[PDB]
Ligand binder design. Structure first.
Ligand SMILES: [Cu+2]
Length: 124
């Protein structure tokens, strides 16, 4: 299955948001990160990627597809706007084994607040 995540800032919190900021997918599912507003990208949050998964980083304003295979929770950020809290979570599969590791990862305060909420919005 494919999903879409829009990268927005006009009329939105901070310097921008991912919408949805929390997604539950299956191995092999693809998420397209869409530059609906300009100025954004998507990148792996170091410390919030399962083993078995590669990191990624898109270009600013790139329409960017990521295929998620390894089970677990993935934290993602917008590179320039990470400090301002532009982050999201993608969960691959049920019962993510790396949940405790990712809950303990360090992030800027505004990012951490949104990640904590996003993890709880996946029913974790
Ligand atoms: Cu951004």
């Amino acid at each position: 299955a494919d999903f879409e995540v829009h990268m927005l800032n006009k009329g939105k919190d901070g310097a921008g948001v991912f919408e949805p900021a929390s997604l539950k997918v299956a191995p092999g599912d693809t998420v397209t990160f869409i530059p609906t507003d300009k100025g954004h990208n998507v990148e792996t949050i170091k410390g919030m990627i399962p083993d078995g998964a590669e990191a990624f980083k898109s270009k600013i304003n790139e329409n960017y597809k990521v295929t998620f295979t390894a089970p677990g929770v993935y934290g993602v950020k917008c590179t320039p706007h990470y400090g301002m809290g532009m982050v999201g979570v993608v969960q691959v599969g049920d019962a993510p084994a790396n949940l405790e590791a990712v809950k303990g990862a360090k992030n800027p305060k505004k990012a951490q607040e949104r990640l904590d909420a996003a993890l709880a919005a996946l029913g974790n």
